[PDB]
Design a protein around this ligand. Structure first.
Ligand SMILES: Nc1nc2c(ncn2[C@@H]2O[C@H](COP(=O)(O)OP(=O)(O)O)[C@@H](O)[C@H]2O)c(=O)[nH]1
Ligand SMILES: CCCCCCCCCCCC[N+](C)(C)[O-]
Ligand SMILES: CCCCCCCCCCCC[N+](C)(C)[O-]
Ligand SMILES: CCCCCCCCCCCC[N+](C)(C)[O-]
Ligand SMILES: CCCCCCCCCCCC[N+](C)(C)[O-]
Ligand SMILES: CCCCCCCCCCCC[N+](C)(C)[O-]
Ligand SMILES: CCCCCCCCCCCC[N+](C)(C)[O-]
Ligand SMILES: CCCCCCCCCCCC[N+](C)(C)[O-]
Ligand SMILES: [Cl-]
Ligand SMILES: [Mg+2]
Length: 355
């Protein structure tokens, strides 16, 4: 069936010795199929391009050398432009991504998926000779993305450099050239209705230096922020804060009104805070999250109370921990309120108004 064309897009910087092994294993994996290899090199101080062309004698290789541009994601964007296939396959050149699982990726695509992700973290997925710490940092960084970007909440390895997609997913789509995690750009901005993750083993690099470890983490966080903006999450967070501010005023307002009407201070606090919660739910339901209301309004009201209570607990615990660590009580209090707001937003975004 793969009379349809497959383009294997490979970004390279100083990837030399690996090419011979790479192309060999790729060809054997994709034996007899209509495929091309598209190498995108940013004028390596390295011979290859050169080695690439030479294997063009034996392998269907298209070589793109760019002198004006640098960057991993930028190269992949270039690959999409230069590729002529119906299905794109993106992978590294160092054999950490095994060419032998490419058939499973394209098979998923033929079976009806728009994107097939080579994933280290779904059932079956593994990583080879990783220290436990590095594995934590990885899944920890991934967790941040899944929570901050609800669209990829259920993706286990959204930062993978190894994936396949129908050309339709990214044609007509403007992808941001900055960064490394091109898949995350695609998951957010691409056109698709079905993604699957396919387990594989992230193997040992065989030969050559590493060019990205570690130069990725704070870029990754700025990438997340750009995507939060794009998704309207930043907008929701600002509106949520504004509502939250109004709630503080409403709380103090009723507290004053109640005690001056002959109601004891430590009795008046209860209706005052509950009214502030009701106030906060109301504006968030008709403004902040108006477009993603589901089910009964009472069910949302109850979930909102859970988030509000969770916020108060986080605020309490954070404050005292910081006080025990020797932090000034005003800073401690500030951080408590900020983390409370953060937790309340996350719980309301993922539970009260879940998507
Ligand atoms: N074209 C291009 N390729 C890059 C760039 N940075 C990294 N790569 C390629 O991306 C692939 C994976 O990079 P690698 O160093 O193995 O990342 P690591 O697995 O985290 O160590 C390799 O084939 C590199 O050649 C870049 O700036 N431009
Ligand atoms: C879960 C939140 C992700 C952390 C965001 C890290 C990037 C912050 C730097 C981007 C600059 C933001 N700003 C407001 C100055 O434009
Ligand atoms: C807390 C200071 C920040 C200023 C924001 C004050 C609330 C702005 C509400 C604008 C919404 C009005 N409108 C018509 C768009 O619904
Ligand atoms: C469809 C209308 C959307 C609601 C308009 C904006 C509601 C903001 C109400 C809270 C702001 C109160 N305060 C004190 C900050 O001005
Ligand atoms: C059964 C005891 C309940 C203790 C929990 C107290 C909840 C405090 C909620 C504070 C939120 C008020 N405000 C103005 C920030 O919305
Ligand atoms: C919705 C509750 C608000 C009702 C009226 C609130 C009156 C505002 C407080 C007036 C001044 C209070 N204080 C302590 C500064 O004197
Ligand atoms: C931010 C937490 C500090 C709030 C101070 C007042 C707390 C008094 C108990 C509030 C109980 C809230 N509610 C609605 C569950 O009753
Ligand atoms: C991991 C949860 C941390 C619990 C924080 C414990 C707070 C202890 C505060 C003690 C000071 C208050 N007081 C009035 C009893 O002195
Ligand atoms: Cl709230
Ligand atoms: Mg590598």
């Amino acid at each position: 069936f793969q009379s349809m064309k497959v383009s294997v897009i490979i970004p390279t910087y100083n990837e030399r010795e690996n090419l011979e092994e790479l192309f060999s294993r790729i060809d054997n994996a994709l034996q007899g199929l209509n495929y091309e290899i598209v190498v995108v090199d940013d004028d390596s101080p390295d011979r290859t391009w050169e080695k690439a062309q030479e294997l063009s004698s034996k392998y269907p290789v298209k070589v793109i050398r760019r002198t004006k541009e640098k960057g991993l994601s930028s190269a992949v964007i270039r690959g999409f432009k230069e590729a002529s296939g119906d299905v794109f396959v993106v992978m590294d050149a160092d054999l950490q991504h095994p060419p032998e699982v490419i058939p499973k990726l394209i098979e998923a695509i033929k079976n009806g998926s728009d994107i097939a992700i080579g994933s280290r973290y779904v059932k079956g997925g593994k990583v080879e000779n990783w220290p436990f710490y590095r594995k934590l940092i990885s899944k920890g960084a991934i967790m941040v993305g899944r929570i901050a970007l609800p669209k990829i909440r259920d993706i286990k390895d959204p930062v993978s450099g190894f994936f396949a997609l129908r050309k339709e997913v990214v044609e007509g789509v403007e992808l941001n050239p900055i960064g490394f995690k091109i898949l995350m750009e695609i998951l957010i901005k691409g056109k698709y209705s079905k993604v699957v993750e396919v387990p594989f083993t992230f193997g040992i690099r065989a030969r050559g230096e590493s060019k990205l470890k570690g130069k990725t983490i704070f870029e990754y966080l700025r990438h997340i922020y750009r995507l939060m903006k794009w998704e309207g999450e930043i907008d929701r967070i600002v509106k949520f804060s504004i509502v939250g501010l109004s709630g503080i005023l409403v709380n103090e307002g009723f507290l004053w009104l109640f005690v001056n009407l002959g109601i004891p201070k430590e009795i008046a606090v209860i209706p005052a805070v509950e009214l502030s919660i009701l106030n906060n739910f109301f504006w968030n339901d008709i403004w902040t999250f108006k477009d993603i209301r589901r089910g009964s309004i009472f069910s949302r009201l109850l979930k909102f109370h859970i988030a509000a209570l969770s916020g108060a607990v986080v605020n309490f615990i954070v404050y005292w921990i910081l006080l025990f660590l020797g932090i000034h009580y005003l800073i401690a209090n500030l951080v408590g309120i900020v983390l409370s707001f953060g937790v309340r937003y996350v719980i309301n975004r993922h539970v009260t108004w879940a998507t």
